[PDB]
Amino acid sequence: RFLKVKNWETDVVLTDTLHLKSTLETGCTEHICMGSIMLPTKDQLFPLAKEFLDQYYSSIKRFGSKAHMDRLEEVNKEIESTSTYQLKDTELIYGAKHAWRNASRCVGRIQWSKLQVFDARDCTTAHGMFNYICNHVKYATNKGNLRSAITIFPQRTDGKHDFRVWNSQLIRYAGYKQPDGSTLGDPANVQFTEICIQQGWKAPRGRFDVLPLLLQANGNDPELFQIPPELVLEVPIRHPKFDWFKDLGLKWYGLPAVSNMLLEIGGLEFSACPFSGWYMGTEIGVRDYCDNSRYNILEEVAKKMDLDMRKTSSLWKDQALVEINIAVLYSFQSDKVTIVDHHSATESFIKHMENEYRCRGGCPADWVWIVPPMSGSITPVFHQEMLNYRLTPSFEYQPDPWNTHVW
Amino acid sequence: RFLKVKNWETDVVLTDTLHLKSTLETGCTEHICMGSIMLPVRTKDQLFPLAKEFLDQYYSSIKRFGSKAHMDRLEEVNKEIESTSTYQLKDTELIYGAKHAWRNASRCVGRIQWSKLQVFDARDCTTAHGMFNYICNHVKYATNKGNLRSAITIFPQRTDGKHDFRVWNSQLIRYAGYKQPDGSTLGDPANVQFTEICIQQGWKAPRGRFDVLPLLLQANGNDPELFQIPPELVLEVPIRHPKFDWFKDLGLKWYGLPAVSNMLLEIGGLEFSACPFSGWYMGTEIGVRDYCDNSRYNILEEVAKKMDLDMRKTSSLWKDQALVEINIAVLYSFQSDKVTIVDHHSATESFIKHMENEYRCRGGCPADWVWIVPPMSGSITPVFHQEMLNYRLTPSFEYQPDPWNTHVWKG
Ligand code: HEM
Ligand code: HEM
Ligand SMILES: Clc1cccc(CCCNCCc2ccnc(-n3ccnc3)n2)c1
Ligand SMILES: Clc1cccc(CCCNCCc2ccnc(-n3ccnc3)n2)c1
Ligand SMILES: C[C@H](O)[C@H](O)[C@H]1CNc2nc(N)[nH]c(=O)c2N1
Ligand SMILES: C[C@H](O)[C@H](O)[C@H]1CNc2nc(N)[nH]c(=O)c2N1
Ligand SMILES: [Zn+2]
């Protein structure tokens, strides 16, 4: 019940007590582990609020104080009256920072307390949502010197008036299925690229077409909006060794911004809460570029490197993979856009783990996601045992809006 | 209940029913997942149900469930248990048992091969010298001049736990490790403690970088004894790189036979604490873990130096770059010398097919994603994209404490 996690490269043992505050369920049982599975009322509300406010007030060293008790009563009064309640700006910022802190799949959490929270709860329309998003995009990009940020639209009321950003990321490339049977652009977005067109988008059918924003306010039908190109910073991908690499016509966007997730704070649900940080190199080079169901460019690059692709045992796929990722990091660094390599990031995460064990008694972490999709065992986190569990406040997944939207 | 796993690269969805037959525990709960934790004497009371459950499986597999042969055997085992407090497995049951424990090894990527396992019955063994003889025959059969064959040798089961057979080596063939006075390590750092024991037990160490450890064998609860595996039985491969001619000059070699000797085989409640088994290597075992782990030979630096890599910033990915070449050299060398080896693409791809087959014919395939995914180039192998369920079936291979911590020394 007081658990220990061992790093097998350094012999460091940390003790975990934080897990004994976990409330939500993992998907696992004593008989079966689901660690690699991607997704395993008024009375409901107040204990949730209470748990949150207790944490908040303990974090500011006024646990059980006047203000604490006062606030507890105040919220309690509001819930009974209004069937919900509103967070104070202080609570909102704290909630959001702690949702990031608790996100067991994010490797970048050492930065957690340096989050810029944009309070967009006064927003009422999609145009409004568009304005708030552009401001977020411009602020976070910061001419290439990325700053972490989140923008928080109004909380769910009766699930009929939900704010949603339909895009999965604020900035993604389009996906077109060809008569050819092949697929142009990003295949992860083929369906989303479709719905953009069904609602009205004038697709230019290219390889790297920046998708439009598709914003839903107050439960209404969603609306399309083109992000000003001058706000979308992009990096052309070249290789500091292969002059031919540029001829591949590869580029990527600099701002990684998750927009499809649900932020839960003290029982309240924020269904539109786009957040952004900066890329770990492998996210683009390994996953976006090399996944079979994505841009899948390994064959092209290997062909261009003139490798023996006759045999898996030549490790040509591995060879190309490295070069590509060298290029990605190179291109971002040369255009002065923030990016972190998988070595630096994981190293920082181990440090963050030590801090969290020390100042908080633990750090929930999902090894399957923290370990980079290349060179796993030459990063420190490979040899680091982790305990995975769900704390609140949290970022949760939520259904794609098209499957739910009452048109 | 039915459970679904999804491959996100192919959208193939599989349904697991097999997990219902799982009794042992995972270490996880509804509130915590211990999926990355490496490591989260038995009365007649608990033994016969275990025996029944095993024999029931056995008889089902041979399509004789409920037969007279089946019922008579259950009867025989029950009577033998209460009379003698234990029981003996038939040769057929032992073979079936050993294969199925490999089959259920959720951390093993090579299980497509599970049904082709040479089982050597060493239950008539009584002494360490007898253990050495058996182990030699294993090494020679499995090696087969480089055309490797999977094999397991099974020494007598545990009785009261005071008479255990144990192989003290973690692997039948491994290299010595020596801590120097200056704090550096010569040879394999993972074998420092074990090398020290051997030296203490009387081993005369050449003190080199690749000294094949002697065998330290414990029979019937007695103190362990040292034996040197005949060198001519130890197949080794010099590591060279197909383009880099300076690579040979690193002075690297490895052995061809990968053989786990410190695990415990459970079959029908019986405990076989000495059960060394061998397969063949997936390249990354040597190339990535053996050579490049910081706590192992750790050759990434010297290799990268000689590659003239920009080692000044980690964002040059010099480490990743060296890692690949080293793994290229390992596979190259083994194939050149015609010793069996498999690359991680080939091996993971076969495992996906094996897994799909197991769901269709068996209703499941327990699998530990944290272990199954190779330690380099994870997402360009198909297992990375494969959802897996992990649970514990018997028969099984289990960890057991190192015998130097538990042994009661005679003297
Ligand atoms: C600032 C530098 C950051 C870095 C280097 C970073 C890194 C990562 C990486 C590599 C992933 C894996 C994504 C994938 O493979 O799909 C991830 C996921 C995640 N990150 Fe971050 N992140 C950063 C900032 C943030 C911020 C600002 C937030 C929220 C405030 C956040 C919350 C999350 C969450 C909730 C996930 C899980 C996403 C999912 O489950 O699909 N991260 N992060
Ligand atoms: C024939 C080719 C085989 C291949 C390519 C293979 C592959 C692997 C690999 C890569 C591992 C991970 C080892 C590590 O990273 O520490 C492993 C683990 C394991 N294998 Fe195999 N294996 C083979 C044969 C066998 C055989 C014959 C058996 C048993 C009869 C077996 C049983 C196991 C077990 C029990 C583990 C877990 C080891 C542990 O937890 O330390 N494998 N296998
Ligand atoms: Cl459950 C499940 C099943 C299929 C696909 C999936 C997508 C996971 C994508 N995760 C978001 C990736 C992403 C993209 C841009 N930026 C970030 N990002 C930014 C800061 N932190 C993370 N993260 C989930
Ligand atoms: Cl639980 C835990 C914690 C720290 C170290 C540890 C040792 C893992 C060793 N795994 C076996 C490695 C190995 C070596 C040679 N051969 C094989 N092998 C042969 C057939 N299948 C696997 N496997 C366990
Ligand atoms: C099946 C498996 O759970 C799936 O492929 C996971 C593996 N680990 C991951 N890790 C990260 N960081 N991102 C991912 O999308 C995934 N996908
Ligand atoms: C802490 C972590 O679980 C540990 O380092 C695991 C990770 N995955 C592994 N996978 C394999 N094949 N072998 C290992 O030793 C490990 N080590
Ligand atoms: Zn689990």
For residue B63, give every residue at least 6 positions away whose Cβ sits within 8 Å of its Cβ, in sequence order, or none: none
Taking the C-alpha atoms of residue B90 and residue B86, their distance in angstroms, rounded to an integer, is 13
Measure A292 CA to ligand 5 centroid, in angstroms.
14
Taking the C-alpha atoms of residue B219 and residue B125, their distance in angstroms, rounded to an integer, is 8
Q: Tell me: do B102 and B213 sit in the same domain.
A: no
Tokens encoding B58 = 């056995």
A368 annotated to a ligand binding site: yes
Q: Tell me: do B26 and B156 sit in the same domain.
A: yes
Taking the C-alpha atoms of residue B62 and residue B64, their distance in angstroms, rounded to an integer, is 6
**Ramachandran assignment for B281, one of left (phi > 0), alpha (psi -120 to 50 degrees), beta (any other):** beta
DSSP state of A183: E
User: What one-character-per-residue DSSP string does B37-81 give?
Assistant: -S-----HHHHHHHHHHHHHHHHHHTT-TT-HHHHHHHHHHHHHH
Taking the C-alpha atoms of residue B380 and residue B378, their distance in angstroms, rounded to an integer, is 6
Tokens encoding A49 = 């609020």
Tell me which residue in B31, B289, B345 faces A377 most closely, judged by beta carbons.
B289
- The reply to whether ligand 2 has any atom less than 6 angstroms from the CB of B285 is yes
In a domain, A320, yes or no: yes
For residue B157, give every residue at least 6 positions away whose Cβ sits within 8 Å of its Cβ, in sequence order, or none: B86, B123, B270, B271, B272, B273
In a domain, B243, yes or no: yes
In a domain, A182, yes or no: yes
Q: Tell me: do A29 and A116 sit in the same domain.
A: yes
Q: Which ligand is nearest to the CA of B391?
A: 7
Q: Which residues of chain B does A33 touch, with a Cβ-Cβ cutoff of 8 Å? A: 26-28, 33-35, 389-391
Taking the C-alpha atoms of residue B93 and residue B350, their distance in angstroms, rounded to an integer, is 28
DSSP state of B394: S
**Is A238 an annotated catalytic residue?**
no
Atom of ligand 6 nearest to the CA of A386: 1
Taking the C-alpha atoms of residue B318 and residue B250, their distance in angstroms, rounded to an integer, is 18
Q: Tell me: do A207 and A356 sit in the same domain.
A: no
CB A339 within 8 A of CB B253: no
Neighbours of B399 (CB within 10 A): 10
Q: Which ligand is nearest to the CA of B388?
A: 5
Closest CA to A336 of A233, A261, A217: A233
Q: Which residues of chain A does B328 touch, with a Cβ-Cβ cutoff of 8 Å? A: 314-315, 319
Q: Tell me: do A297 and A178 sit in the same domain.
A: no
Which domain CATH number covers A101? 3.90.340.10
> How many structural domains compose chain B?
3
Residue indicated by tokens 């910022």: A93
Taking the C-alpha atoms of residue A130 and residue B106, their distance in angstroms, rounded to an integer, is 49
**Ramachandran assignment for B286, one of left (phi > 0), alpha (psi -120 to 50 degrees), beta (any other):** alpha
Tell how far CA B411 is from the center of its chain. 31
In a domain, A4, yes or no: no
Closest CA to A57 of A69, A46, A48, A47: A69
Closest CA to B323 of A377, A181, A364: A377
User: What chain A residue is nearest to B28 in terms of C-alpha separation?
Assistant: A30
Residue indicated by tokens 């094999």: B151
The domain containing residue B274 runs over which residues? 16-123+150-160+264-278+348-372
Tokens encoding A186 = 């990003």
Q: Tell me: do A95 and A168 sit in the same domain.
A: no
Q: Tell me: do B170 and B76 sit in the same domain.
A: no
Collapsing DSSP states into helix, strand and coil, what is residue B401? coil
In a domain, A153, yes or no: yes
Collapsing DSSP states into helix, strand and coil, what is residue A134? helix
Taking the C-alpha atoms of residue A384 and residue A354, their distance in angstroms, rounded to an integer, is 11
CB burial of residue A249 (10 Å; 0-12, 13-18, 19+): exposed
Structure resolution in Å? 2.0
Taking the C-alpha atoms of residue B321 and residue B300, their distance in angstroms, rounded to an integer, is 9
Collapsing DSSP states into helix, strand and coil, what is residue B194? helix
Closest CA to A103 of A291, A263, A323: A263
User: What one-character-per-residue DSSP string does B216-267 give?
Assistant: EEE-TTPPPEEEPPPGGG--EEE---SS-TTGGGG--EEES--EE-S-EEEE
Taking the C-alpha atoms of residue B82 and residue B184, their distance in angstroms, rounded to an integer, is 56
For residue B117, give every residue at least 6 positions away whose Cβ sits within 8 Å of its Cβ, in sequence order, or none: B98, B99, B102, B150, B151, B152, B277
CA angle B255, B256, B257 (to 5 degrees): 100
Collapsing DSSP states into helix, strand and coil, what is residue B10? coil
Taking the C-alpha atoms of residue A97 and residue B263, their distance in angstroms, rounded to an integer, is 46
Q: Tell me: do A51 and A99 sit in the same domain.
A: yes
Tell me the residue type at B139: V
DSSP strand pairing (B281-282 vs B341-342):
parallel
Collapsing DSSP states into helix, strand and coil, what is residue B153? strand
User: What chain B residue is nearest to A312 in terms of C-alpha separation?
Assistant: B345
Which domain CATH number covers B213? 3.90.440.10
Q: Tell me: do A49 and A139 sit in the same domain.
A: no
CA angle B135, B255, B110 (to 5 degrees): 80
Which domain CATH number covers A334? 3.90.1230.10
Taking the C-alpha atoms of residue B94 and residue B121, their distance in angstroms, rounded to an integer, is 8
Count H helices and E strands in chain A, helices first.
Answer: 11, 16
CB A376 within 8 A of CB B378: yes
Neighbours of B40 (CB within 10 A): 13
Q: Tell me: do B203 and B188 sit in the same domain.
A: yes
Pocket of ligand 6 from Cβ distances under 6 Å: A 8, 382-385; B 36, 38, 370-371
Q: Tell me: do B129 and B143 sit in the same domain.
A: yes
**Catalytic position from the list A109, A156, A164, A238:** A109
In a domain, B382, yes or no: no
Taking the C-alpha atoms of residue A107 and residue A364, their distance in angstroms, rounded to an integer, is 11
In a domain, A11, yes or no: no
CB A57 within 8 A of CB A71: yes
Closest CA to A296 of A159, A156, A187: A187
Closest CA to A225 of A140, A132, A120: A132
User: How does A32-66 read in b/e, with b if 16+ C-beta sit within 10 Å?
Assistant: bbbbbbeeeeeeebbebbbebbebbbeeeeeeeee
- The reply to whether ligand 3 has any atom less than 6 angstroms from the CB of A359 is no
Q: Tell me: do A154 and A47 sit in the same domain.
A: yes
In a domain, B38, yes or no: yes
